[PDB]
Amino acid sequence: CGRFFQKHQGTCFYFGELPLSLAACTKQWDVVTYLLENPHQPASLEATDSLGNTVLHALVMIADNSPENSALVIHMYDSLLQMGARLCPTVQLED
């Protein structure tokens, strides 16, 4: 959490202030995957931030109406939803 990381008017880029959120927003499916199957300590896919946003909220926040950004956020959203289904099929992330 910092001035550059919060959403304001100026020099900033909000990504969810989470390593998993950053990896998802930066278009790397391999890094997102690897954080999840760590034997040491897996990254919880339902963790939140100061604003309370999750990995799925952050993707919505960084979304634009441009074609490429929309395609990227759609694909990442679907992939993360499937990954949440295979990891944790009890809790549903959409609600």
Residues that bind a second copy in the complex, under the rule CB under 8 A: 11, 13, 15, 25-27, 64, 66, 68-69, 72
| Paired tokens of 56 | 């799925």
| Residue 46 C-beta: closest distance to a second copy, Å | 24
| Residue 3 C-beta: closest distance to a second copy, Å | 14
Q: Which is nearer to a second copy, 70 or 92 (CB)?
A: 70
| Paired tokens of 36 | 């999840």
In terms of Cβ atoms closer than 10 Å to its own Cβ (0-12, 13-18, 19+), residue 31 is: middle
Phi and psi, residue 65, nearest 5° = -90, 0
| Residue 28 C-beta: closest distance to a second copy, Å | 9
Q: Which is nearer to a second copy, 60 or 88 (CB)?
A: 60
Residue with tokens 């304001």: 8
